[PDB]
């Protein structure tokens, strides 16, 4: 994975959790970031796109932002169904292709 994400975390229901990612000028510094959620055993799906836009049907407990070569996804009011792996995805101008973070697991206690 070209992008470095914050390590997996355990958190309680209703906690606020922020997953962050950092890259370089050729990806996050010049391209918008998307956030992919991978639920256990399910196909991965887009939660957020264009830095801060919610995919249709996604809860507004999710919020996104980008600054410089870093970006983050914040989950407010954490809930058991949010237990998942979260991946940043962005375009990389040097690779001329998609690059991804290694993933961050959120475990809901």
């Amino acid at each position: 994975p070209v992008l470095t994400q914050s390590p997996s975390v355990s958190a309680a229901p209703r906690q606020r959790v922020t997953i962050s990612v950092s890259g370089s000028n050729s990806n996050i510094g010049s391209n918008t970031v998307n956030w992919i959620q991978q639920l256990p055993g399910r196909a991965p799906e887009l939660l957020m796109y264009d830095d801060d836009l919610l995919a249709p049907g996604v809860s507004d407990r999710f919020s996104g932002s980008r600054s410089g070569t870093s970006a983050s996804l914040t989950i407010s009011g954490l809930q058991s169904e949010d237990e998942a792996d979260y991946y940043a995805a962005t375009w990389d101008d040097s690779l001329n292709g998609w690059v991804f973070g290694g993933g961050t697991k959120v475990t809901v206690l």
Binding site: Y49, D50, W98
Partner: protein, 56 residues
């Protein structure tokens, strides 16, 4: 509503959207057609972003 009709067909032809996303955007168009431009923009961006899922 020719411009909105055009946005409707352009959303329907975006190859990377799934049916829930497409139906959500179209529902937004029907709810308030005056937001068509904004909705179209978002759909285009989401279509591009959906391509990342195929590389993932």
């Amino acid at each position: 509503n020719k411009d909105q009709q055009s946005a409707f067909y352009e959303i329907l032809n975006m190859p990377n959207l799934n049916e829930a996303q497409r139906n959500g955007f179209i529902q937004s168009l029907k709810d308030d057609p005056s937001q068509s431009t904004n909705v179209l923009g978002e759909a285009k961006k989401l279509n591009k972003a959906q391509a990342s899922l195929k590389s993932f």
